[PDB]
């Protein structure tokens, strides 16, 4: 509703300004407005959407963890639990908003492999965040929703993108984190990270200097996780 009266181009322009100003809540609201205009997003626009929401939820997740840790150490009255709950609900709300944009209608209109993989990666990531705070049975269906999104993205990426494609690499990095941190599957995590690294290494020779820089940055983050996990 709220951005309904602003031009799509103005929303994108303002999202970029908000990024420069480190006003990520505003950035996210601008990009939501832009998505709700109903047109497909370009590559640059998808990146703006992703940056905005990653910063918003990243703050929320960091606060949630601080509060959860205090709550665990308490096990005073109801305040820590209440405030943890408040932050958790706000986080769930942001995740639901993102998931709702993906479902209405970014994924369904995404035909090119790069756009489709991008959005399905996002869908996995935001179900993963919901999983981090979920408890019990809804927890299982949330975890399976994340897994299903990542798996669909992986299947498309393997068929349609080079092993060095940054989106493909990032997806593999995040799905490997899903396996290690959420699914209790450290061996799958390690396998995925190693195979992804090795297949990218083998394709580096095909890259220009600028593409090489991007691919190798992500490869280093895969290696960093492998180091931590072994």
């Amino acid at each position: 509703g709220a951005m309904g009266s602003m031009e799509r181009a103005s929303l994108i322009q303002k999202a970029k300004l908000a990024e420069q100003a480190e006003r990520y809540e505003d950035m996210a609201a601008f990009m939501k407005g832009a998505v709700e205009k109903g047109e497909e997003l370009s590559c640059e626009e998808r990146n703006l959407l992703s940056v905005a929401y990653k910063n918003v939820v990243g703050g929320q997740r960091a606060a949630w963890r601080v509060l959860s840790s205090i709550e665990q150490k308490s096990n005073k009255g109801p305040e820590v639990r209440e405030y943890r709950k408040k932050v958790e609900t706000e986080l769930q709300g942001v995740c639901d908003t993102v998931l709702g944009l993906l479902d209405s209608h970014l994924i369904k209109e995404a035909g090119d492999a790069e756009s489709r993989v991008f959005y399905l990666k996002m869908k996995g990531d935001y179900y993963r965040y919901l999983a981090e705070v979920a408890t019990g049975d809804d927890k299982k269906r949330i975890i399976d929703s994340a897994r299903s999104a990542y798996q669909e993205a992986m299947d498309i990426s393997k068929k349609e993108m080079p092993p060095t494609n940054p989106i493909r690499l990032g997806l593999a990095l995040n799905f490997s984190v899903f396996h290690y941190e959420i699914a209790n599957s450290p061996e799958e995590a390690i396998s995925l990270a190693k195979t992804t690294f090795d297949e990218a290494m083998a394709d580096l020779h095909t890259l220009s200097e600028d593409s090489y820089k991007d691919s190798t940055l992500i490869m280093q983050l895969l290696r960093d996780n492998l180091t931590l996990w072994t």
Partner: peptide, 8 residues
């Protein structure tokens, strides 16, 4: 927790 992808 393990690091996931940062922003570009």
């Amino acid at each position: 927790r393990t690091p996931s992808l940062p922003t570009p």
